[PDB]
Structure 1
């Protein structure tokens, strides 16, 4: 019977774009609790997870928890050409795979996309079980500034706590970069349980922050001493886009 209706097509693909950043192949999981998809880089350091609880979907039907593996290259291409604002999105099961259908209000244009898909059994959603002392919440825009001037100076970002401040430095002895973030300059919220410092790939931070485009809502960052970084945003129309970034040395 399987049916998914999400209130906003653009927001839905902000998810899809983020997990299909390096490969166009994707495994979506339909379960009792809703929809979730996951991707890890081949070097294991950047994991991207999308999660959409069912209460957020307008229409949801599944016979049994199932997975779908599909190549989404094409679909991605054509929807970027769907000049659309508020359009809703449907994915209904097809005898052969999927059936994405979008409707534009101003034009009346029902574009239905037929893609082939191999059904399967559910992956298991799991969440690094780890305690992250430092939490700050800010803006995709702020993060994008940081990524871009971090990558200009080096290959690795080093984030640390000081006194009510988050410190971000990158680079080598010649050309260093150093940023200090704090409450209302520009952080929306800040909590530091215990002092902590860690180091991450700039390239990987660049990419996780790239998946935050199309997510305008507050963004939450968390980490700890030689622990991973968690970045997580809730889509306006509902559903969490989350990133996990492995630490170094």
Structure 2
């Protein structure tokens, strides 16, 4: 059966806690190239993706692709029992569902839980296929700060960039907001293939941005009136990926 080991219980938990508007049930997809879960909010504007490349999965045994629909809440309880920040996690398939084990060699302790879960066919990962004209990398704390700013003024965020500057703007009831992100302030990297501009929902961009704080190297990509992509990497491989539908 399916069996996989992840090197960080803490990081795993951070990822799951980042699933915005996630219902009590999710579908963990076990594939050859990665374990992943992806759902699309009812409004169809935001696509939340949780993905762990096979490169960051040790002792990974898998006969054939399969997906297990489990209660995300139970999976959070067990990950919180992580005595240390060096605790690992193993995922083991079961006839009844999924067995999750957290191991902490440091304190010589362990914990497990048998989660009842329906077995189904893998939910294919359908990320938007577009050319990200603009990509930049920054610490999540900054984006969180920008989320706080946005939660003050506008209702729609207009993000746009030239060769050296990324600009976010909002306007509401006579009040105005406009932040500027540039290289080394605070962007760690900036790639502008061509001047681009798009508009996104503040409600959605705010929620997402706030979540990206769990990463120190968030990658944001977008282009002219195309969906924006946020990558929230962890130091152990586990990855959060968001897709925001632009306002046209």
TM-score range (shorter-chain normalised) is: over 0.9
C-alpha deviations, 1:1-60, integer Å up to 9, x for none? 210100111111222222364312110111121211102111011111122121211111
Q: Matches of 1:123 and 1:75 in 2, distance apart?
A: 19
The two structures have a TM-score, normalised by structure 2, of 0.93
Partner of 1:231 in structure 2? 230
Secondary structure of the corresponding residue to residue 129 of structure 1: coil
The two structures have a TM-score, normalised by structure 1, of 0.93
- The answer as to whether partners of 1:90 and 1:102 remain within 8 angstroms in 2 is yes
Q: Matches of 1:199 and 1:114 in 2, distance apart?
A: 44
Q: Matches of 1:99 and 1:92 in 2, distance apart?
A: 5
C-alpha deviations, 1:159-200, integer Å up to 9, x for none? 112452111111225111110111111111112122111111
- The answer as to whether partners of 2:231 and 2:240 remain within 8 angstroms in 1 is yes
Greater mean deviation of Cα atoms: 37-46 or 168-177: 168-177
Pairing 1:190-205 to 2, within 5 Å after superposition: 190-205=190-205
- The answer as to whether partners of 1:19 and 1:26 remain within 8 angstroms in 2 is no
- The answer as to whether partners of 1:221 and 1:230 remain within 8 angstroms in 2 is yes
CA 164–50 in structure 1, closer or farther in 2 if over 3 Å, else same: same
Uncovered stretches (5+) of structure 2, i.e. residues with no partner: none
Partner of 1:247 in structure 2? 246
Q: Matches of 2:173 and 2:190 in 1, distance apart?
A: 30
- The answer as to whether partners of 2:155 and 2:172 remain within 8 angstroms in 1 is no
The reply to whether residue 12 of structure 1 matches residue 22 of structure 2 is no
Whichever structure has more strand as a proportion of its residues is 2
The reply to whether residue 170 of structure 1 matches residue 170 of structure 2 is yes
Pairing 1:1-249 to 2, within 5 Å after superposition: 1-19=1-19, 21-162=21-162, 164-172=164-172, 174-216=174-216, 218-249=217-248
RMSD: 1.7
- The answer as to whether partners of 1:19 and 1:39 remain within 8 angstroms in 2 is no
Q: Matches of 1:51 and 1:189 in 2, distance apart?
A: 23
Aligned residues: 248
Displacement, 1:78? Answer: 4.7
Q: Matches of 2:235 and 2:116 in 1, distance apart?
A: 29
- The answer as to whether partners of 2:36 and 2:52 remain within 8 angstroms in 1 is yes
Q: Which consecutive aligned stretches of 4+ in structure 1 deviate over 6 angstroms post-superposition?
A: none
CA 213–179 in structure 1, closer or farther in 2 if over 3 Å, else same: closer
Secondary structure of the corresponding residue to residue 17 of structure 2: helix
Displacement, 1:213? Answer: 3.6
